Design a protein around this ligand. Sequence first.
Ligand SMILES: OC[C@H]1O[C@@H](O[C@H]2[C@H](O)[C@@H](O)[C@@H](O)O[C@@H]2CO)[C@H](O)[C@@H](O)[C@H]1O
Ligand SMILES: OC[C@H]1O[C@@H](O[C@H]2[C@H](O)[C@@H](O)[C@@H](O)O[C@@H]2CO)[C@H](O)[C@@H](O)[C@H]1O
Ligand SMILES: [Ca+2]
Ligand SMILES: [Ca+2]
Ligand SMILES: [Ca+2]
Ligand SMILES: [Ca+2]
Ligand SMILES: [Ca+2]
Ligand SMILES: [Ca+2]
Ligand SMILES: [Cl-]
Lengths: 128, 128
Amino acid sequence: CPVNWVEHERSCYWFSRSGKAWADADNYCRLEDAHLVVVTSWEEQKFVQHHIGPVNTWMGLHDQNGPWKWVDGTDYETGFKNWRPEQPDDWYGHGLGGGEDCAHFTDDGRWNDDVCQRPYRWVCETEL
Amino acid sequence: CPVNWVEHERSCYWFSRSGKAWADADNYCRLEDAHLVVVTSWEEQKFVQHHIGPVNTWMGLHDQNGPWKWVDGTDYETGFKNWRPEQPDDWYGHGLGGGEDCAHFTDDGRWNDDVCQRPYRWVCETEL
Ligand SMILES: OC[C@H]1O[C@@H](O[C@H]2[C@H](O)[C@@H](O)[C@@H](O)O[C@@H]2CO)[C@H](O)[C@@H](O)[C@H]1O
Ligand SMILES: OC[C@H]1O[C@@H](O[C@H]2[C@H](O)[C@@H](O)[C@@H](O)O[C@@H]2CO)[C@H](O)[C@@H](O)[C@H]1O
Ligand SMILES: [Ca+2]
Ligand SMILES: [Ca+2]
Ligand SMILES: [Ca+2]
Ligand SMILES: [Ca+2]
Ligand SMILES: [Ca+2]
Ligand SMILES: [Ca+2]
Ligand SMILES: [Cl-]
C-alpha cells in the first residue's frame, strides 16, 4: 500500500479528511488508480466504519444509470447490502432536482442513497 | 424582463427550483447576463423571501477572495446586512475542508455563511 493508505485484508484504503461531490470523489480515486470503496462483507463494513467514525461518507455504489451498480463491476444483487431501514428511497423532497442516486455510509454505518452533488468525505480502495 | 423572470423595483429575478454549488450557480447567472441576487434593502429582502419560501438559497455574497464582496461590486460594509444571530462564523467543524465562504438565505430569510460546494437553490438578478 502507498504511504498514508491503510492495509486491510488484501486491500489498501485511503480515508479523506475533506468533502467532494460523488463524481469528483469518484474521479479523485481514479487518479490514484483506485476506486471508491466497494464493500462486500460485514468484516469490511466494520473496518471502514471504524476508520470513518459517525460521518456521512461516499462509497462506490450508485444508480445514476438505472440499476444499482458498484464502481468496479462487483454485482449488486448477489452482493453484500447494509442499507438503513427505509433506504434506499430515491427521495425527491430535497427539492434540488432528481431523486437520490449515490450511496453513502451514514452516522451509524448503514447506507443511505443521497443527492450526488452533496459534498461528503469519501474512501478510496485498491486491491493488492 | 425575460419570460419566467419576475419584475420588482426595476430588477428582474429568476428563482431556481433545483440546486447547484455556489460557483455553478454563479456561472449559471453569468450565462444569462445576470448575477446571483444582490440584496440592498429591507424591501428587496422581503420580496426575495416571499418567492423562495423557507428554503436555503444562495445569494451573490462571498468571501472566497478575502473580505466579504457582493458579486456585482456593491459595497458590503456600507450596505444592507441580514445575518442570522452568531453569523457569519467561518465554521470549519463541518469537516469538508476550509471554513465557510458563501452566503445563503436560511429558512427564516436571515443569512448564513456556508460551504460553497453545497447544492442549494439560487436566485439570479438583472437590472432593467
Ligand atoms: O425523508 C427521506 C430522507 O431521509 C433521510 O434520512 C433521515 C432519516 O430518515 C431519519 O430517521 C433521521 O435519521 O434523519 C435523517 C435525515 O438526515 C435521508 O438522509 C434522505 O436521503 C432521505 O431518504
Ligand atoms: O455551529 C456552526 C454552524 O451552525 C449552523 O447553523 C445551525 C444552527 O447552529 C442550529 O441551531 C440549527 O438552527 O441548525 C442550523 C443549520 O442546520 C450553520 O448552518 C453553519 O453554517 C455553522 O455556522
Ligand atoms: Ca472492497
Ligand atoms: Ca435513485
Ligand atoms: Ca435516501
Ligand atoms: Ca438587487
Ligand atoms: Ca469565510
Ligand atoms: Ca456559518
Ligand atoms: Cl449538502
